[PDB]
Amino acid sequence: SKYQVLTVGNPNSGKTTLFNGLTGAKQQVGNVTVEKKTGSFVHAGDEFSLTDLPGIYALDSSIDESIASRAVLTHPADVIINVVDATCLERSLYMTLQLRELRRPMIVVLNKMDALKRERVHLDLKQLEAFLGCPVLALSANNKEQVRRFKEKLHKLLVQGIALKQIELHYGAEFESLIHELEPMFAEQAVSARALAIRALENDRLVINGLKEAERQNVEQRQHECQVDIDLLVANVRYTYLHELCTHVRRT
Ligand SMILES: [Cl-]
């Protein structure tokens, strides 16, 4: 078998560190002047082809952010590996939530967790898994032993298929109804139509430009409809969720 993997996360999350740990020395060529970094390894007969997305804080349409946002929607991947810095979860997991809305196979890799044990803060990864609805693993991206064990675990997961349960993240009645009017427009695409509709409601360039004139005017009309500023409602919903989540999964 061949498996294709994307590594994604915030700058200095350690996604580059994990990328490097898993690949050793391997290739580099462009996405445009922006450089595209690719590497491989072999484990248990199977080959692994990895692409590293530039570091981003959010999937917004800013050229590095553009590339990454494009790539999580359209680039082939058997799995997305979201590397997360554990020492600032409220910020890090924002993108995680966006990634979960896509409903593409993914894993969340919690980095920097020995830094967190300093503070005498522990995380319940069982519950965090229950919240996110994807695999969550603890892994220091900078020790090669744990990265190597991670190779076997990744191989396992890819082999049996990654079980995911859809993230229960609700935007309130008015926004849900707007999402609902628009999903058909985005049905039977390579990604969840709900995420595409959310992207469109956010006036995402990437999604919106794929549309014909009529349906563009339908999206823009739904934007106009919404009483609350959208970018702000999406943030309150999301950061409220991470506060909920963080208050369940943390203990000092
Ligand atoms: Cl899902």
Author numbering: 1 to 31, 35 to 64, 70 to 260
Authors' description from the paper:
For this bacterium, Feo is the primary system that transports Fe2+ into the cytosol. FeoA and FeoC are known to be small (ca. 7–10 kDa) cytosolic proteins, while FeoB is a large (ca. 80–100 kDa) polytopic transmembrane protein that contains an N-terminal soluble G-protein-like domain termed NFeoB. The status of GTP and GDP bound to the NFeoB region is hypothesized to control the opening and closing of the FeoB pore and therefore the translocation of Fe2+ into the bacterial cytosol.
To overcome this issue, VcNFeoB was recloned into a vector encoding for N-terminal (His)6 tag fused to a cleavable SUMO moiety. Expression and purification followed the same procedures as previously described (vide supra), and the SUMO tag was cleaved prior to crystallization. Using the 3.7 Å resolution model, we were able to solve the 2.3 Å resolution structure of the tagless protein (Rw/Rf = 0.203/0.266). The X-ray crystal structure of the apo VcNFeoB NTPase domain reveals the presence of a typical NFeoB fold. Distinctly present are the two common NFeoB subdomains: the globular G-protein subdomain that is responsible for binding and hydrolyzing nucleotides (blue) and the hammer-shaped guanine-dissociation inhibitor (GDI) subdomain that regulates nucleotide dissociation and connects directly to the FeoB transmembrane region (red). Within the G-protein domain, two switch regions (known as Switch I and Switch II) that regulate nucleotide hydrolysis and communicate nucleotide status to the GDI domain are present, albeit Switch I is mostly disordered, while Switch II is mostly ordered in the apo form. These observations indicate that gross structural changes in the NFeoB region do not account for the observed nucleotide promiscuity of V. cholerae FeoB per se.
